[PDB]
C-alpha cells in the first residue's frame, strides 16, 4: 500500500514534484462490503492482501491522430497484464475498485479527455456486413490487451451507441486547461451476487478524446496518460477438475 | 503462534445520525449581502439573487389555492408503467386450411421482442429489468367471420420437449397447463408469472440442459431451430382430423410490475439481427437532420 | 406476519411480500406508510447551516 | 338466474385497460430479487442529466462526424459578427433532437426542451477574450447587431478563470400550440432563439494555438414536466431483421 | 368482428387498411362482436385549456387568426382534434353491409 | 457453528437473502406434486360402427389408463383424496353443434 | 340485468386452477379417518433417507446384476492407481439415476444431486489399509496422480476400526445452467466429479480372503430444494396394458 | 357458474340512463380548472334577468 | 363447537370438521394456530446439555 511495495518508483515522464492531484469526495476509505446471499452448494473466500496494493499498467500515448481506446474487466486482472498469481485458479470473483487517471502537460497545451465506465458493456463488434447471429462471439477482440484498443468509430461507439448521451453513466472531463487528475470508485454491478473467472465480462473503461488534442510546432508532440487502480474488496474461490493432487 | 493479521479498510465517524419522521418542509433560507450592483463595475455582470420557499397549500399558510391550471387533469402519466401502458400486437400466428406455412395445425410460437424493432428500441434504455406478463388472444377468418370451433392453447416452460405433430404425446401431457374455449367465446386473458432463473432478464448462458455461454466447445446455442429454449407458446385445432375454416390468431403481451436497473444511451443505428447488437458499420448515419450553415437557421 | 425476501434470503425486502387473494378481493405488492419495518427518512441534520464563510485557510 | 341485471358494456375487449387476471403456476416462488444498485424510479432523473449537444451540426460523412459535437472560436474576426444560432424546439428537429432530453420528448406531445444548459471551455492555458451570450423571447425576432441583443436579457463571457457558464432558459406559454380540427390549413409555429456574438477578439500570446473549441451542455430542473403519452414514430428499422 | 380505435390530438390519420397507425401501440383500440352488447365507453377531458374554445389548439404548428406560418387545414382533416377510426377485422373485405 | 434462523431469530438490521425474492419457495407438498389434471378418459361416439352403436357408453374410474399416472401414484400404500372432473365434447373435426 | 360488467375472461377452460366445486351425493359422511403411523407430510424427507447407489454398473446381463452395487478393493496394486470416478448430476444418467434421490430429481428442473454420502467397508475383520478420497470443484479436471488429488479437499481413510466415512459435497451456483432460446446450438455442460485413489496397499494376515467389497449410500440435507414442477417422460411402459 | 341467477332486464340499451363507464387513458390528468368569473349554477337566474 | 372425528369414533382429531358453506364464501379442513384441542409442541426438556463427558465407566 501506501505508494511503495515492489513498484516505488513515483515520477513519470514529466518528473514532476510539488504535491500531488486527487479530490476526494468520500471519507477516506468508507468501510467495508458485504456478502450477499447465494443459492447453491457453493460458497467462497477471501485472499485479504497481496491484491491490496496499487497497480500501474502500460502508459498509452495520445496523439492528433489519436481516436480512443477501452479496456475490458477484469481481463487486465488475469495474467494479460502485471497480476496473473491469483486469478486463473479459482473460480468466484467480485470486487470495488479505485481507479485514478494523471495525465500531464504543459500550459501550452490543448485539447479535452472524457472517461466512462460502461456496465456490461457488450461490444457489438465493428460488424458492418459481418452477418452473425448467433454462431461463435469473438475472442480476439473483445479481449485486447493491458493495453486496450483504439476505437473504429467513435461516434457510434463501435457499437452503435451514441457517443453524445454516454454521461449518463458515471464521468469526469478530463481537461488540458486546468486540472490533470480522475478519481473514479466503481462498486460491484452484477445481477448474479458472484461472477465467474470466464466469458462473463464485467463493466469496461472508455476513454474517448472529444476536444481533439493541438498545440505549435516545436513543442513535445505526444502527451502520455496513465492508468492505476485498486481492487478493494476482492476475493477468489471455487475450484474441482480432473485428477488431483 | 499466529503472527500475520491485516484488513483495515473501515472508516469512523459520522456514519448515521438520529432517526425522525419529518416529512414536512419548512421555510429555509433568507438573503445575504455581497457588494455594489452595477453592470459594468469590472469583473463580472448579470448577477444573481435567491428566495425562500413554499410548498403548494401544505406548507406556510392556505389562505388562497391558486395553481397554474384549474384541475386540467392528472400529473403523473410519466412512471415506469405509465411508458408502458398499452399493449401491442406481438403474434400474429396465422393457420391456413390447406398450404405450407402451417398445414398439420399446430403452430409453435416463443416469447421474444425483437418482432417489434419499436418495442426492443423502448425495452433496451436499461440493463437490468424484473417485470410480469399477461396474455391477451383473439381469433379471426381472414375475411373477419366468426366460426363454431374449439381450440386448444398451452403454455410450454422453459426446458420442455417440442410438440412438432399432432399426434405428440405432449399435447396431452399433464404438466404443461392447457386452456380450452371456443372462438366464438370472449378472449382468452391469462397471466405469465416471473419465470426467469436469476434477478433480472439477461441473456447469455440461460437456457439449454446444457452448458451455454460465450466460446462454446460443450454446447450450442441451436438447440435445433428453437434457439434459446425458453418459454413459448403452441395451440392446435381440436379435433381427430383438419378443421373446416380458416384461422388468424393474436397475441397482446403486456407488462405489469416493471421495474428498471442501470440505464445506458439508448441507440443511434438500425438494428440487424437477434441477439447480436451489429450495425452498418459501413452505412453509418448522422442523428438528427442537419441544416446548412450554423450562422443561420 | 412478515416475510424477509419470501422464504430465507435477504435482499427483497420491501420489495416482494404476500402472493394474492380471491378472484374478486385481490390486492398486490407494496408498502405503507405505517407499520413498517424501520423508516429510512432519518438523516439531514445539517440543511443551510453558515451561509458562506467554510474555510478561508489559504 | 341470479337477482342481477344484464349489463351493457361486458363482452368487448379494451387495450388499455386491466382486471382480474389468471395465474397459471400455482407451485411457483420466484427469486426474491436483491437490492441491486441503480434502480430507476421515474422516466425523469433522464431530463437533468448532463449530455453533450450538437450544435455545428454541418457535416453529414462517416469520417468528419466528430466536429459535429463542437464548433471554432478561432482569432479572425473579433468585434461584432455572430458565432451561431438555433431554437428551443426539443423534439422537432436539430440540436436536441441528439441529446436525451429530445430523446424522451420524442414520446409525448407537452414538452419545453428549455431551461439551463452549459459551455465548457477548451482553450490552452492562456486565452482570453469575452463572449457574449442572449436569449430571445418567444415571438421576437434575432437582433441585427451586438447592441440590440445587449438589451433584454444576456450574459458576457470570459476566459481568465471561467471555463464554464450555465445560462438558464425561462418558461413561458401564452398561445396555442396546435388546435388543428384538421390538418394542412394551419403553418403558425414560432419559438425563441439563442445567439452567440463576438464581444471583443481572441487575446492569444505568442507560442500558443489559434483555434480553439467550446462544447456545449444540456439538462433542466425540477419544474416541467411531460404528459399526453403517445406512441412515438420513427424510421429505425430495416425491415430484414432475423 | 369490430375493430374501434380513439386518436387522441395531433395523432397521425390511418388512411389505409395497410396502415401501420392500425397496430399501434399508443392508440387505445377495443375489439367487440356485433351480436355483442354495444360498447360503452368513456372519454376524459381533452383539452390543453380550462375550457372549450377553438382558434390556436390544433397543429403541430402556429394557428390562430391571421395566419402566415400555419395553414388550419392540415388537409382534410382540419383542426386536429380528438377523432374516431373502425375498420372491418379481416385480411380481406367483409360478407354483410354495415350502418 | 452457533445459530440463526432468518430474519425472525436474533437481529433484524439486514435481510440478505440468496435470491432478491424471485419467486415462492413451496412447490413440493403433496398437492404441488398432484398439481395438473391429466386426460383420463376419451370416450368417443359415433354415429354408426361397431363402438357405441346405440348412443349408450359405460366407463368406470381407474388409474391403469395412464402408466405413468399409475408409476406417480404407486409410490404409497395408503392414500386419502377427493376428486373432480371435467367434460369437453367435440366432433372429430371440432366443431360445436347443437345438442 | 344486475348492475354487473360483461367479463373479458369467462368462458373459458384452464387445466391449472380451482373454484367453487360441486358435491353430487349431499346425504353423505365418509369413513372417519383414523391415525395410521407413517404419514408422510411433503415430497422431501425421501431425499434424505439413504439407499444404497450403484458404480460399478458395467454388468448389463441378468444373472450378474448383482454386482452392479459393490466394486473390488483386491490387493494386486496399491501405491498410486484409481479406483473409479463419477459425476454429480441426479437426474441425467448413470448412479444417481438407480437411487431415490435421482428418482426424485427426475421430476423437477432445479436439482443439486449433492451433500453427503456414505461407504460401508466388508472387509472381514483383519484388513487394514487406506483409501484417498477427493472431490473436484465444478469447472475443474480430475487429477492425473495421487499428489494433485491430495490438494483442495480431501480425506484419508483406513481400515482399522472405521468400517464407515461420510463425505459431504460442497453447493456452488456460478454459471447459466441452460439458457436455450432454441434447441441444438449449445452443448455447454460441466460438473465436479469424485475419485477414489489407492493410498497404501491391502494388507491382510496369512489366511483371510484377498478381495473385499465396498458400498456406497447416498443422502442429502436440509439445506437444497427441487423447484419448478415439470412433467416427467420416460418409457415405463409396454403399450399392452390391459 | 356462481350462486347467480339470469336477470331478465339486460343485454338491452337504453338512452336516459348511466352505469359503469370505462376511461381509456389512465395516465392523464387534465388541466386543473381555475375560478373563472361568471359560472352559471342553474338554468334559472336567466328566467328571471 | 368441536366434533371428535365426524360422529362418535376417535382418530380423525384434527383431521376432519365441518362440511362445507354457501358457493361464494365457503372453507374446508384445517387447524389453526389458537383455539385448539391441545398443543402437541410441549416436549424437549433437554436441548444441548454437557458437550461430550456422558459416561466413560469402561
Ligand atoms: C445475447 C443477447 C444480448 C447480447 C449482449 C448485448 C447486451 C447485453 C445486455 C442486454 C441483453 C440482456 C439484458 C436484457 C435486455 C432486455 O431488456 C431483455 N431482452 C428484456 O426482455
Ligand atoms: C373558431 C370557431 C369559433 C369562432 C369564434 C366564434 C365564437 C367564439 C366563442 C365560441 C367558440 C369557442 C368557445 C366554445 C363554444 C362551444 O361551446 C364549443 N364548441 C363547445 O363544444
Known sequence: ?245 | ?297 | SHENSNSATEGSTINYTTINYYKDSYAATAGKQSLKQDPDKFANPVKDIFTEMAAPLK | ?242
Open chain 2, 1 to 297: 503462534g499466529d503472527r500475520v493479521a491485516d484488513v483495515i479498510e473501515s472508516s469512523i465517524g459520522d456514519s448515521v445520525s438520529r432517526a425522525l419522521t419529518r416529512a414536512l418542509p419548512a421555510p429555509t433560507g433568507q438573503d445575504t449581502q455581497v457588494s455594489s450592483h452595477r453592470l459594468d463595475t469590472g469583473k463580472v455582470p448579470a448577477l444573481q439573487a435567491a428566495e425562500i420557499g413554499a410548498s403548494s397549500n401544505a406548507s406556510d399558510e392556505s389562505m388562497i389555492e391558486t395553481r397554474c391550471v384549474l384541475n386540467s387533469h392528472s400529473t403523473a402519466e410519466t412512471t415506469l408503467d405509465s411508458f408502458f401502458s398499452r399493449a401491442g400486437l406481438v403474434g400474429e400466428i396465422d393457420l391456413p386450411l390447406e398450404g405450407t406455412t402451417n398445414p398439420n395445425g399446430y403452430a409453435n410460437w416463443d416469447i421474444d421482442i425483437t418482432g417489434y424493432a419499436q418495442m426492443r428500441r423502448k425495452v433496451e434504455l436499461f440493463t437490468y429489468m424484473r417485470f410480469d406478463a399477461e396474455f391477451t388472444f383473439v381469433a379471426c377468418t381472414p375475411t373477419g367471420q366468426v366460426v363454431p370451433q374449439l381450440l386448444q392453447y398451452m403454455f410450454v416452460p422453459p426446458g420442455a420437449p417440442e410438440p412438432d405433430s399432432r399426434e405428440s404425446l405432449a399435447w396431452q401431457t399433464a404438466t404443461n397447463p392447457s386452456v380450452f374455449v371456443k372462438l366464438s367465446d370472449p378472449p382468452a386473458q391469462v397471466s405469465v408469472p416471473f419465470m426467469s432463473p436469476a434477478s433480472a432478464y439477461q441473456w447469455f448462458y440461460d437456457g439449454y440442459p446444457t452448458f451455454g455461454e460465450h466460446k462454446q466447445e460443450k454446447d450450442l446455442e441451436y438447440g435445433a431451430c428453437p434457439n434459446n429454449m425458453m418459454g413459448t407458446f403452441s395451440v392446435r385445432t381440436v379435433g381427430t382430423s383438419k378443421s373446416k375454416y380458416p384461422l388468424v390468431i393474436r397475441i397482446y403481451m403486456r407488462m405489469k410490475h416493471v421495474r428498471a436497473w442501470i440505464p445506458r444511451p439508448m441507440r443511434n443505428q438500425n438494428y440487424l439481427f437477434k441477439a447480436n447488437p451489429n450495425y452498418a458499420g459501413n452505412f453509418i448515419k448522422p442523428t438528427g437532420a442537419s441544416r446548412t450553415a450554423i450562422t443561420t437557421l
Open chain 1, 1 to 245: 500500500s501506501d505508494r511503495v511495495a515492489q513498484l516505488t518508483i513515483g515520477n513519470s515522464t514529466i518528473t514532476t514534484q510539488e504535491a500531488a492531484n486527487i479530490i476526494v469526495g468520500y471519507g477516506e476509505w468508507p468501510s467495508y462490503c458485504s456478502d450477499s446471499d447465494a443459492t447453491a452448494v457453493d460458497k467462497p473466500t477471501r485472499p485479504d492482501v497481496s491484491v491490496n496494493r496499487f497497480y500501474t499498467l502500460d502508459t498509452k500515448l495520445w496523439e492528433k491522430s489519436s481516436k480512443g481506446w477501452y479496456w475490458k474487466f477484469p481481463d487486465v486482472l488475469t495474467e494479460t497484464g502485471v497480476f496473473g498469481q491469483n486469478a486463473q485458479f479459482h473460480y468466484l470473483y467480485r470486487s470495488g475498485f479505485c481507479i485514478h487517471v494523471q495525465c500531464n502537460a504543459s500550459k501550452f497545451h490543448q485539447g479535452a479527455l472524457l472517461v466512462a465506465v460502461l456496465p456490461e458493456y457488450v461490444i457489438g463488434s465493428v460488424a458492418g456486413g459481418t452477418g452473425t447471429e448467433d454462431t461463435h462471439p469473438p475472442y480476439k477482440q473483445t479481449q485486447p490487451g493491458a493495453d486496450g484498443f483504439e476505437l473504429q468509430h467513435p461516434y457510434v461507439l463501435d457499437a452503435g451507441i451514441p457517443i453524445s448521451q454516454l454521461t449518463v453513466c458515471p464521468h469526469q472531463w478530463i481537461n488540458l486547461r486546468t486540472n490533470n487528475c480522475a478519481t473514479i470508485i466503481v462498486p460491484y454491478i452484477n445481477a448474479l451476487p458472484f461472477d465467474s473467472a470466464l466469458n462473463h465480462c464485467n463493466f469496461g473503461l472508455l476513454v474517448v478524446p472529444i476536444s481533439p488534442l493541438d498545440y505549435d510546432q516545436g513543442a513535445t508532440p505526444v502527451i502520455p496518460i496513465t492508468i492505476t487502480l485498486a481492487p478493494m474488496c476482492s476475493e477468489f474461490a471455487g475450484l474441482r477438475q480432473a485428477v488431483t493432487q
Open chain 4, 1 to 242: 338466474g341470479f337477482p342481477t341485471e344484464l349489463k351493457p358494456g361486458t363482452n368487448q375487449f379494451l387495450t388499455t385497460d386491466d382486471g382480474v387476471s389468471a395465474p397459471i403456476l400455482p407451485n411457483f416462488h420466484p427469486t426474491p430479487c436483491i437490492h441491486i444498485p441503480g434502480e430507476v424510479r421515474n422516466l425523469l432523473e433522464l431530463c437533468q442529466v448532463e449530455t453533450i449537444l450538437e450544435v455545428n451540426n454541418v457535416p453529414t460523412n462517416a469520417t468528419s462526424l466528430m466536429e459535429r459535437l463542437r464548433f471554432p472560436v478561432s482569432a479572425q474576426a473579433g468585434k461584432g459578427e455572430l458565432c451561431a444560432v438555433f431554437r428551443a424546439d426539443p423534439g422537432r428537429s436539430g440540436p436536441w433532437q441528439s441529446t436525451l432530453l429530445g430523446q424522451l420528448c420524442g414520446y409525448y406531445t407537452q414538452w419545453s426542451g428549455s431551461l439551463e444548459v452549459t459551455f465548457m471551455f477548451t482553450g490552452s492555458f492562456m486565452a482570453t477574450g469575452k463572449m457574449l451570450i442572449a436569449y430571445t423571447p418567444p415571438g421576437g425576432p434575432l437582433p441585427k447587431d451586438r447592441a440590440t441583443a445587449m438589451l433584454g436579457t444576456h450574459v458576457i463571457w470570459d476566459f481568465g478563470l471561467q471555463s464554464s457558464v450555465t445560462l438558464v432558459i425561462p418558461w413561458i406559454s401564452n398561445t396555442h400550440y396546435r388546435a388543428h380540427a384538421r390538418d394542412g390549413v394551419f403553418d403558425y409555429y414560432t419559438t425563441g432563439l439563442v445567439s452567440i456574438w463576438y464581444q471583443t477578439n481572441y487575446v492569444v500570446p505568442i507560442g500558443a494555438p489559434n483555434t480553439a473549441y467550446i462544447i456545449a451542455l444540456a439538462a433542466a430542473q425540477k419544474n416541467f414536466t411531460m404528459k399526453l403519452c403517445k406512441d412515438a414514430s420513427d424510421i429505425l428499422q430495416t425491415g430484414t431483421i432475423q
